[PDB]
Paper text:
We selected the ECD of the transmembrane protein PD-L1, which binds to the ECD of Programmed cell death protein 1 (PD-1) to suppress T cell function, and which has not, to our knowledge, been shown to bind α-helices. A screen for PD-L1 binders afforded two clusters of Helicons (C61 and C62) that were both predicted to compete with PD-1 on the basis of their on-phage competition behavior. Cocrystal structures of PD-L1 with these two Helicons showed that the two clusters both engage the PD-1 binding surface of PD-L1, but occupy distinct α-helical sites on it. The asymmetric unit of the [name] / PD-L1 cocrystal structure contains a symmetric dimer of two [name] / PD-L1 complexes. To assess whether this is an indication that the [name] / PD-L1 complex is a dimer in solution, we performed analytical size-exclusion chromatography and time-resolved fluorescence energy transfer (TR-FRET) experiments with PD-L1 in the presence and absence of [name], FP30790, a non-PD-L1 binding mutant of [name] that differs by one residue (FP28141), and BMS-1001, a small-molecule PD-L1 binder that has also been shown to induce protein dimerization. We observed clear evidence of PD-L1 dimerization in the presence of both BMS-1001 and [name], but not in the presence of FP30790 or FP28141. Taken together, these findings demonstrate the ability to discover multiple α-helix binding sites to a relatively small ECD that was not previously known to have any, as well as the ability of Helicons to induce protein dimerization.
To target disease-causing proteins that are inaccessible to small-molecule or antibody therapies, we are exploring the use of a nature-inspired drug modality that exploits the intrinsically favorable properties of synthetically constrained α-helical polypeptides (Helicons). Here, we report a rapid, high-throughput screening platform utilizing phage display that enables an unbiased mapping of the α-helical interactome of a given protein without any prior knowledge of its structure or known binding partners. Analysis of 14 high-resolution crystal structures of Helicon–protein complexes across six different protein domains reveals a range of binding modes, all of which are “side-on”, i.e., mediated exclusively by Helicon side-chains rather than involving main chain amide interactions. Biochemical and structural experiments demonstrate diverse functional impacts by the Helicons which bind these sites, including inhibition of protein–protein interactions, inhibition of enzymatic activity, induced conformational rearrangement, and induced dimerization.
Author numbering:
A (entry chain C): 1 to 17
B (entry chain A): 18 to 131
Write the structure that this text describes.
């Protein structure tokens, strides 16, 4: 699911920031 | 049914060299940028986010900024091509490409670094 992929990249990036 | 394939699911590479792992996705006649979603990740790090022709560099993990590179020329050819310049030991692990082009599928590639 490409929508699911966007959510995980958003969460993980937000965590690294 | 849309299926992603990989030529090699194991890459053995030398430390400090360049590498390009590939994910092949079905493209027919022309590429529709407005319909392609491509994702690259390894372990718990974002590498590439490229959604309908827009690449977001803010989401890319810091250890891959200035080294990680998606060769968009190959996209017209149906090839998701991840280029990492000057690979490190930390670049070893399980990689994953995620493509959406109509349907959606993913495959995994192991990268080992000598
Ligand atoms: C589905 C989705 O968009 N999830 C999501 C997760 C994280 C964030 N941003 C932060 O966590 C900072 C946005 C959206
Ligand atoms: N932060």
């Amino acid at each position: 699911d490409p929508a699911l992929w966007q959510c995980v990249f958003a969460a993980r990036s937000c965590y690294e920031e | 049914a849309f299926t992603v394939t990989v030529p090699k699911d194991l890459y053995v590479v030398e430390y400090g060299s360049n590498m390009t792992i590939e994910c092949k996705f079905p493209v027919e006649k022309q590429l529709d940028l407005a319909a392609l979603i491509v994702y690259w990740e390894m372990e718990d790090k974002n590498i590439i986010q490229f959604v309908h022709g827009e690449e977001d560099l803010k989401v890319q993990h810091s250890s891959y900024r200035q080294r990680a590179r998606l060769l968009k020329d190959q996209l017209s050819l149906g090839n998701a091509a991840l280029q990492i310049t000057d690979v490190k030991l930390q670049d070893a692990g399980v990689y994953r490409c995620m493509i959406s082009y109509g349907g959606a599928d993913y495959k995994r590639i192991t990268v080992k670094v000598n």
